[PDB]
């Protein structure tokens, strides 16, 4: 299943990403429900913006792991998971654009 362009690696951890208050506290409460990283074929675009790249990962991931992005409540899970997966799909860099 995980060979989607957006499957959640989901190893069961709390990561090291500074969310700010409400996000980080909600993460600590139920973190096993969230990803570790993504498998969006790394990134092979010699000309991609962040708002192109990580966006494409998200337009993929929303359809990868649909059962997560259909919670009945879980408010802060959006503001965590959307930011979480954005960092997971931003990181350091891809290639053409670099530090």
Please give the domain boundaries of the chain with CATH numbers for all domains. 1-99 (1.10.790.10)
Question: Cβ-count burial of 75 within 10 angstroms (0-12 exposed, 13-18 middle, 19+ buried)?
Answer: exposed
Beta carbons within 10 angstroms of residue 27's beta carbon:
21
4: phi then psi, degrees, rounded to nearest 5: -75, 160
Round to whole Å and give the CA distance between 87 and 69: 17
Find all residues with CB under 8 Å of 91, minimum gap 6, and list them: none
Method in brief: NMR
Question: CA 58 from chain center: how many Å?
Answer: 7
């Amino acid at each position: 299943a995980e060979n989607r362009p957006g499957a959640f690696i989901k190893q069961g951890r709390k990561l090291d990403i500074d969310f700010g208050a409400e996000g980080n506290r909600y993460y600590e409460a139920n973190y096993w429900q969230f990803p570790d990283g993504i498998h969006y074929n790394g990134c092979s675009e010699a000309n991609v913006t962040k708002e192109a790249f990580v966006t494409g990962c998200i337009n993929a991931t929303q359809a990868a792991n649909q059962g997560e992005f259909q919670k009945p409540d879980n408010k802060l899970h959006q503001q965590v998971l959307w930011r979480l997966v954005q960092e997971l799909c931003s990181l350091k860099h891809c290639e053409f654009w670099l530090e």
